[PDB]
Structure formats: C-alpha cells, structure tokens
Design a protein around this ligand. Structure first.
Ligand SMILES: [Co+2]
Ligand SMILES: [Co+2]
Ligand SMILES: [Co+2]
Ligand SMILES: [Co+2]
Ligand SMILES: [Co+2]
Lengths: 224, 223
C-alpha cells in the first residue's frame, strides 16, 4: 500500500520537469506554430500530472498514511460549483444540465469538501461523455432506507447503459498499486474508479442502476 | 521491450508531449530553448520507463505473466541485441565484443521476446556503469550440475556494486517490508525484472562484482 507514496518524488519529479520547462518556454519568443506545440505540452502534461496526483492521493488514503478531512462546509455551494464547471459545455445545445436538491437535506454537512467535489466532478464528467443528446440530472436527496438518514447524491445520464460485467467491475473495484498504472480495456477509466474508492473510504455505498441510461450514486453517512 | 501495457490514460498524454518535443526540435530554437525541449523529451521518456518497470515487477511477482515455448535462432537473437547497442558504443567510444562457444546450439526452445528483454537489460546496465572499458557478452554452455545448461553473461569494467547493492539485486521483492531504496529503483529496476524473468524461465541469476559480471543460467532440452 505504501510503495507509490514512498517513490512519490521519483514519479512527480520528471512530470514537474516537463511542466517547468513548458512555463519557461512560454516565457521565451515563440512563433505561433511553436506556441501551438508548447501550449499542447502544457495542456497534456497538466492532464497527466493531475492524474498522477490523484493516484498518489488515493494511494496514501488506502494505506493508513493520510486521513480524510473533517470540516463543516456548504454542501449546496459545493454542488453549485461543480455544476458551474460543466455549464459552459452545457451551453452547447445537445445537453441540458438539471439539478434537484430535496428541501430537507442540510445546507452544511461535515466531511471532506475537496475530495467530495472530486467524486461529484468525476460522475458529472462521465455523464457528459456518455451523452450525445439529452439531459444530465444531478439529484441530492436524503436516504432513509437505513437506520438513520444517509445523504444521497446521484448523477443520471441518457447514454449507452452499463452492462452487468462493467457494473460488477466498478462496484467491486479496489486497485492496489501497480493496478493504477495498468491497462485494462474493460469498463471504466481511472477517475471513476478513484472516485468510487473515495466513497468507500468516506464510509459510503456506491450504486450503479441501469433502461437507456445509467444512474451512478453515492450514499454517505450523516451525523444526526 | 516491456511485458505490460500502461494505461492509455497515462500513455496518450505522454505521447502528445513527446510528439510536440519532436515537432519543436524541427523548428529554429535558441540554445536555451533546445535545452528546454531536450529536457522535456528526456523527462517524459524517463517517467514512462519508470512506470513501465513498476508495472512489470507487479505483474511478475503476481504470477501474471506466461512465457512462450517456441524454437528460435539463439545466434540471431544474440547478434541483434548487440546490434542495438553498437550505435551507442561508437559514441561512448566503447568496445563491445562477444563470444559464443561453438558447442552452443543454434536453435533452442523458450520465449525469445523475454530472453531478448533480459539480454537487453544486462547490456543496458553495462553501458550505464562503464564510462570506458570493454563490454563482453558470452554465450556458452555450462557443464556443472546434472544436465547441460545455457549460460549468458555480460562483463563490464565499470564502478561495481557494493555488498548491500548486490544483495538487494538478488533478494529484493516488492512485498518484503521495504522493497527497495527510492534511489536505486530508477537506477536498477530493470535488473530486478531480468532476475524475475530468468527465475520464471527456471534459471538462475548471478552477479559477481570486484568491474561486474551479470550472468544467467538457463535449462536446455537434451540432445
Ligand atoms: Co522521496
Ligand atoms: Co500553467
Ligand atoms: Co456496452
Ligand atoms: Co479513454
Ligand atoms: Co525520441
């Protein structure tokens, strides 16, 4: 569980060198063609760096090395910010972005806002790629089927459903170390798996129900 | 080269970055900019090689890698591994030479892609360790033990492995307490792969330092 965190410098350093030279190159005289290429390094490198930081983060959380945060944060404000991120692409016609919050769910809860926002942003990001046309729905409800009101966040899309094999793969997913860097053509990309493993470390339960769309949902514990 | 495939999520952005570096090198650049681009090119590849090695060791220790059983021209295989390093031996002024005992068969059984990975690993380690000496590749039969076995060794005149470095190579395993020092891994993760492969081939991996001589001994089908 601790191997990737221990070599965190050996992984992050070349990635840091790539982007440091990039921001250095943007400072120098560049032709428009030159700038197109250097800008692409910037965009692609940062994409990869963000992936590497999320792999190290989940690696340290799965081992005992670091702990989730516990602060009182504005739950509605978090959900609102996530929606804002995607509203520019929802501006494009194909997609309607609709969010419904039950009136009883609290305005402020306790937990890890930065990591919960990662989870929600991942579910939204998958919903967008799955839909070519239609509506994307984000519902924040309370869940009473337990012995105490849990919190429920669900994202629903209109794209090509999950089959039983993909669904079972993501539900039981718990990658160890090398697994994160490994290729598996089946099913889900890293963001979804990491987000799903975060909800398990949050004490929550993860749900995938699919007829012509999929509903991905997390259900978290709430302090009464 | 490598046993395992990296996620396309890692691979695709990196391919893009590396793609832009090659395009920019085709462009007029100040000596400062060429250095920035060459550094990006160096870093991207080193990260990719690191990730691939970590993945290969995970697969090997997990028993997730299956070796092939085909017949292959051992001489061919040997002479293309050396072929790969000749352009580098010219630049580093190195003299790379080899010797094959005539009693060695031309054709043997096994996994030529993997045996190739092992041999490329030893040569790559020898060019690292040697600023300048001779790098020798021996293919020979070994007549100790019950049956004849195939022996491949690479000898260099570089800075040798100390006693703790050598014990690490022979004994380090990923799910031992502290598998390896974060300094040596980038340096010599590849040799641990080679060791894992030779043992998966049913052979023995050996190192003797004084220069260094890395050797493997592999089984042979009699006759
Ligand atoms: Co360190
Ligand atoms: Co920037
Ligand atoms: Co399908
Ligand atoms: Co993809
Ligand atoms: Co290149």
């Amino acid at each position: 569980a601790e191997f990737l965190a221990k070599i965190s410098h050996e992984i992050r350093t070349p990635m840091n060198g790539v982007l440091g030279m990039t921001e250095l190159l943007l400072g120098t005289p560049l032709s428009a063609k030159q700038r197109d290429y250097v800008q692409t390094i910037h965009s692609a490198g940062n994409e990869l760096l963000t992936l590497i930081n999320e792999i190290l983060d989940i690696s340290k959380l799965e081992s005992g090395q670091i702990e989730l945060d516990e602060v009182q944060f504005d739950l509605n404000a978090l959900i609102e910010d996530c929606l804002d991120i995607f509203r520019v692409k929802a501006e494009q016609q194909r997609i309607e972005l609709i969010s419904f919050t039950q009136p009883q769910v609290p305005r402020v809860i306790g937990g890890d806002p930065t990591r919960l926002r990662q989870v929600v942003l991942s579910l939204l990001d998958n919903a967008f790629k799955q839909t070519e046309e239609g509506e994307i729905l984000l519902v924040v409800a309370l869940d009473d089927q337990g012995e105490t009101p849990r919190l429920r966040i669900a994202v629903q899309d209109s794209g090509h459903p999950f089959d039983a094999k993909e669904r079972e793969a993501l539900l039981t997913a718990e990658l160890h170390s090398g697994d994160f860097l490994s290729a598996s053509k089946l099913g889900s990309h890293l963001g979804l798996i990491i987000a799903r493993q975060l909800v398990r470390l949050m004490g929550g339960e993860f749900g995938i129900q699919s007829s012509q769309g999929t509903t991905l949902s997390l259900t978290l514990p709430l302090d009464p």
